[PDB]
């Protein structure tokens, strides 16, 4: 992962957010490859104040160096991360609960009919299955009304409380009694971030089983990302050495090396050459040949990299 100078603030912001949410355990900072400090929340980021202090320590360390970066200088961030230790804030947990509460009245199973299975009373009429009211999410689950946790350890939504129903699953007209409907205890879990999001396709869902009974899910999680859960990665902020090619200094990229790097517009370069020559020998001024701070200069926009 490498980024140019103009976008350093949003790169550092990403690293600060990872320190705050416990996904980043340590950052090693280096200027031009020379180690310049390490940023590590004390006590494995147990307290919010220590994680915020780490994010501030990182910004103070780098913001001036990145703001005046040039000359080909660069800044490296060697970042050890763990996506699974992610914690979420009170506001983030509140937003997930708000969405989760919209599933409270949704229907899991419709009333049965003569030709489509569904909700059937446990008491029969004529020894025959009669339909019952639809089975709603709230009939099987009690979604929590509040979030739990702390600023230090993060916030979470408790697992929705499981319930039972005596209503059954069958068809109207059937002398055979309806089948049982039961929560799936392996498909109901709490949400605390931890690199997961709520899987809304699989959550709050009835699944007809091979033996004719029905299982229901509560909250089911999935990964928020495809990227690997753990690792150590190095984010680099670069500056362009060819931004200011000073022909009189001890370090400048040569014309040949510049031409290996970039393809140039032949008209743009030919016209710059002619203006330099005409100014040097004939005294003709040109806007292509700046004289500023004791140095003659010209400006080029490459057509692109050479590939």
């Amino acid at each position: 992962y490498t980024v140019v100078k103009n976008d350093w603030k949003k790169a550092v912001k990403q690293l600060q957010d990872g320190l705050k949410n416990k996904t980043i355990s340590t950052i090693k900072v280096s200027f031009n490859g020379n180690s310049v400090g390490e940023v590590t929340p004390a006590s494995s980021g147990a307290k919010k104040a220590d994680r915020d202090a780490a994010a501030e320590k990182l910004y103070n360390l780098v913001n001036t160096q990145l703001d005046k970066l040039g000359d080909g200088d660069y800044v490296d961030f060697e970042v050890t991360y763990n996506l699974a230790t992610q914690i979420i804030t009170k506001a983030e947990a509140e937003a997930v609960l708000t969405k989760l509460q919209q599933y409270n009245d949704k229907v899991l199973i419709n009333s049965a009919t003569d030709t489509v299975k569904g909700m059937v009373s446990d008491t029969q009429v004529d020894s025959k299955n009669v339909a019952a009211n639809p089975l709603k999410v709230s009939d099987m689950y009690t979604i929590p009304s509040a979030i739990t946790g702390s600023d230090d350890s993060g916030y979470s939504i408790a697992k929705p409380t499981e319930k039972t129903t005596s209503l059954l699953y069958g068809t109207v007209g059937d002398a055979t009694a309806g089948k049982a409907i039961t929560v799936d205890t392996a498909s109901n879990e709490a949400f605390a971030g931890n690199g997961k999001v709520i899987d809304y396709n699989k959550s709050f869902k009835a699944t007809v089983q091979g033996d004719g009974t029905v299982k229901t899910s509560g909250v089911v999680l999935k990964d928020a990302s495809d990227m690997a859960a753990t690792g150590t990665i190095k984010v680099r902020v670069t500056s362009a050495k060819e931004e200011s090619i000073d022909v009189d200094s001890s370090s400048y990229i040569s014309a040949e090396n510049l031409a290996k790097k970039y393809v140039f517009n032949p008209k743009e370069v030919s016209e710059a050459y002619n203006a330099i020559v005409a100014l040097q020998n004939d005294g003709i001024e040109s806007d292509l040949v700046q004289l500023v701070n004791g140095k003659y200069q010209v400006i080029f926009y490459p057509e692109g990299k050479r590939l």
Binding site: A240, E242, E243, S244, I245, D246, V247, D248, S254, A255, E256, L258, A259, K260, Y262, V263, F264, P266, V269, S270, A272, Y273, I276, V277, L279, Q280, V289, G294, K295, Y296, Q297, V298, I299, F300, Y301, P302, R306
Partner: peptide
């Protein structure tokens, strides 16, 4: 992004740009 070549002397700027034009043209 822009590239800025500069020199105290017009002759050194000319030599650099001349070289740049030559190498740009060999491709």
């Amino acid at each position: 992004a822009k590239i800025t070549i500069k020199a105290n002397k017009l002759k050194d700027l000319k030599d650099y740009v001349d070289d740049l034009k030559t190498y740009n043209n060999t491709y």
